[PDB]
Amino acid sequence: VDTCSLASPASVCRTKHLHLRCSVDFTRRTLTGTAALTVQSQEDNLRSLVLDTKDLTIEKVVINGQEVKYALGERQSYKGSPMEISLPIALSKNQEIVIEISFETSPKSSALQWLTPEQTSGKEHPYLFSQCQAIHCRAILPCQDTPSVKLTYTAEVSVPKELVALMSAIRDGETPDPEDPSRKIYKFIQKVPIPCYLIALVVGALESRQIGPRTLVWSEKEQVEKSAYEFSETESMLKIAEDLGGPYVWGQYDLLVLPPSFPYGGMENPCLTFVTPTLLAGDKSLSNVIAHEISHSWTGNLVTNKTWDHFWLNEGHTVYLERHICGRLFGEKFRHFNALGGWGELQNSVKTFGETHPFTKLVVDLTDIDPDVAYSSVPYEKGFALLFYLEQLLGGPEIFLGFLKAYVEKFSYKSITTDDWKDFLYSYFKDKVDVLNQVDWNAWLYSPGLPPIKPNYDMTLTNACIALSQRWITAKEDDLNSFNATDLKDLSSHQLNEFLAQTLQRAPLPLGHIKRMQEVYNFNAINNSEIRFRWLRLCIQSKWEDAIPLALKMATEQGRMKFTRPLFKDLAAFDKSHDQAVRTYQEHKASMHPVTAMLVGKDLKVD
Numbered sequence: 108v109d110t111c112s113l114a115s116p117a118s119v120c121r122t123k124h125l126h127l128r129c130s131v132d133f134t135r136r137t138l139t140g141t142a143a144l145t146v147q148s149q150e151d152n153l154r155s156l157v158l159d160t161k162d163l164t165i166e167k168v169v170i171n172g173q174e175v176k177y178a179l180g181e182r183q184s185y186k187g188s189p190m191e192i193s194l195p196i197a198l199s200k201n202q203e204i205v206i207e208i209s210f211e212t213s214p215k216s217s218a219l220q221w222l223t224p225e226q227t228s229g230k231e232h233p234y235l236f237s238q239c240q241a242i243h244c245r246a247i248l249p250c251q252d253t254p255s256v257k258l259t260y261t262a263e264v265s266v267p268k269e270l271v272a273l274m275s276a277i278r279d280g281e282t283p284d285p286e287d288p289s290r291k292i293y294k295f296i297q298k299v300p301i302p303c304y305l306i307a308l309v310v311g312a313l314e315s316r317q318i319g320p321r322t323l324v325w326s327e328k329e330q331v332e333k334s335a336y337e338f339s340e341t342e343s344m345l346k347i348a349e350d351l352g353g354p355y356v357w358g359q360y361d362l363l364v365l366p367p368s369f370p371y372g373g374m375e376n377p378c379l380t381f382v383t384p385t386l387l388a389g390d391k392s393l394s395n396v397i398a399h400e401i402s403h404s405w406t407g408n409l410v411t412n413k414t415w416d417h418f419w420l421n422e423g424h425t426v427y428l429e430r431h432i433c434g435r436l437f438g439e440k441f442r443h444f445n446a447l448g449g450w451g452e453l454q455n456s457v458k459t460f461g462e463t464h465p466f467t468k469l470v471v472d473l474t475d476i477d478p479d480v481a482y483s484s485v486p487y488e489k490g491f492a493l494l495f496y497l498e499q500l501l502g503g504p505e506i507f508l509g510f511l512k513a514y515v516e517k518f519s520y521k522s523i524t525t526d527d528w529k530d531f532l533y534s535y536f537k538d539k540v541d542v543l544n545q546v547d548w549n550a551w552l553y554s555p556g557l558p559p560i561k562p563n564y565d566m567t568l569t570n571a572c573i574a575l576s577q578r579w580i581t582a583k584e585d586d587l588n589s590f591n592a593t594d595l596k597d598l599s600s601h602q603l604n605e606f607l608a609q610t611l612q613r614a615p616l617p618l619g620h621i622k623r624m625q626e627v628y629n630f631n632a633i634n635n636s637e638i639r640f641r642w643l644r645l646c647i648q649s650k651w652e653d654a655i656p657l658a659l660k661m662a663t664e665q666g667r668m669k670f671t672r673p674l675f676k677d678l679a680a681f682d683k684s685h686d687q688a689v690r691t692y693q694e695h696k697a698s699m700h701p702v703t704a705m706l707v708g709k710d711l712k713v714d
């Protein structure tokens with residue numbers, strides 16, 4: 108049972124297909140049209156069904172050419188309102204019918220951000236983008252909003268003719284709109300069954316550039332050249348991912364670089380991965396995000412978590428594959444460096460929540476919990492740590508990668524639970540069941556806090572980061588003179604970031620130390636978003652008033668939640684910037700992404 112959904116479950120009925128015909132109205136900030144759901148009964152004598160909705164206006168529901176009765180239940184907070192539909196004729200098991208729902212979204216749809224022209228790069232045209240994961244698809248259209256159900260889809264999207272629509276699907280042509288010659292209709296087809304959280308739409312002044320045999324990059328004109336360079340490794344990553352996972356079944360792998368308010372680093376929308384423009388470091392150093400979203404084309408989009416309680420299945424396996432891709436590209440020592448880094452991030456998350464908090468469990472219970480509030484590095488890094496620990500237990504990376512590929516083949520096009528995964532693990536490693544029985548399954552899967560065992564990590568690339576961080580932490584005033592730009596000589600951007608992560612873990616440092624760090628390393632000059640983020644956090648937590656405007660600027664000029672939330676939170680905790688932090692939020696709130704606005708508000712204890 109999916110406790111995040113109010114819809115009929117898959118054991119009652121199953122959506123097979125969605126045909127979406129809609130029009131994007133920028134003047135009203137609404138999407139209007141029809142969602143035609145092909146639904147298969149899973150029960151004898153089925154006379155009604157229930158769908159998820161959130162802030163949707165329902166005009167009518169049509170079956171067999173006639174309007175039918177429906178009722179909207181009372182709103183249940185972030186879950187929205189259940190929509191019960193009375194079928195005109197009782198259905199037998201496996202019978203399929205088509206239900207056409209006429210609907211309109213609210214301008215406040217939590218799935219959508221509507222951008223004015225001034226919020227874009229080009230400054231002439233408006234822009235719209237969606238983000239459905241986890242449970243926001245219901246805020247665009249009525250559906251069984253649960254990843255336990257998979258469906259194909261086709262869509263026709265009417266937009267002002269100067270603009271371009273793209274979706275998580277294969278592009279299927281464009282025409283003038285016969286009802287309004289100021290508009291164009293873009294058509295789309297997704298022929299691989301997907302969970303509805305993978306439905307995506309963007310509308311804006313988009314151009315494209317080819318960067319590989321199956322990849323275009325899309326953005327506004329002013330970002331195209333930079334993005335084409337930044338993500339030039341994409342095809343080589345796809346080839347490695349195919350070796351690890353089996354065939355790529357989705358046809359195209361395009362990339363869309365969003366405006367700065369995109370709340371995530373990446374989102375694995377099928378055929379069209381969405382990325383933050385904060386990846387545009389100029390040197391490809393943040394390309395692990397591409398490798399990660401590529402990997403979801405197997406772990407997530409083919410084998411899918413059955414409910415959000417089992418989210419770690421999606422993210423843990425994907426981080427595991429991500430790090431393997433990067434390991435092939437740049438070496439096994441680099442894979443170990445990033446694995447160790449991720450353990451550090453797990454340390455941070457556990458410290459933040461508290462070692463007994465329910466959100467530090469690998470498998471969670473999301474009953475009455477908004478997924479956006481529970482979201483953290485835990486499913487990512489506790490999940491990766493489990494897989495990395497099992498890798499080392501069961502005989503190494505090539506043995507465990509054999510399992511991963513067999514796992515993907517086994518559960519392709521299905522939605523599964525932790526027990527399904529574990530059962531298959533035991534089946535596959537039939538001859539190592541005694542080794543498997545040494546794992547403390549109850550602790551790993553269901554207990555809060557750090558995992559019961561830390562895996563073994565090569566320290567080669569990490570040693571210099573730790574060494575330099577320790578020099579700074581143990582330095583006294585009379586030691587500050589010895590630090591010099593040459594300290595950074597042999598460190599990669601990845602190592603500089605890790606040096607800062609190590610140091611941030613022991614923050615605050617004395618203000619004089621941080622002032623010296625800027626004097627000799629000039630971190631204010633670095634544009635790499637990950638580095639700048641940790642440096643600004645270090646400054647604010649160490650009470651450097653000079654860093655206040657810098658932190659405010661970064662918190663607001665982009666909206667990746669990873670950066671925006673902790674920067675606002677740090678700014679709120681520093682007495683000198685507290686009032687500015689709350690004021691800046693209040694002034695920006697209306698033009699923020701709805702999810703980001705909500706979470707920053709909660710973080711700051713405002714509204």
Ligand SMILES: CC(C)C[C@H](NC(=O)[C@@H](O)[C@H](N)Cc1ccccc1)C(=O)O
Nearest residue numbers: 240241371372373374375395396399669
């Ligand atoms: C390299 C990755 C760790 C990057 C990470 N992105 C992801 O994990 C994406 O695949 C996730 N699909 C992001 C997500 C998770 C849950 C709800 C909405 C969106 C991110 O930070 O955005």
Ligand SMILES: Oc1ccc2[nH]ccc2c1
Nearest residue numbers: 241415418471478481482
């Ligand atoms: O967005 C999500 C989805 C599933 C989850 N499980 C735990 C946190 C979480 C967040």
Ligand SMILES: [Yb+3]
Nearest residue numbers: 278279280296
């Ligand atoms: Yb076609």
Ligand SMILES: [Yb+3]
Nearest residue numbers: 583584585586
């Ligand atoms: Yb001294």
Ligand SMILES: [Yb+3]
Nearest residue numbers: 693712713714
């Ligand atoms: Yb208030």
Ligand SMILES: [Zn+2]
Nearest residue numbers: 399403422425
């Ligand atoms: Zn992911």
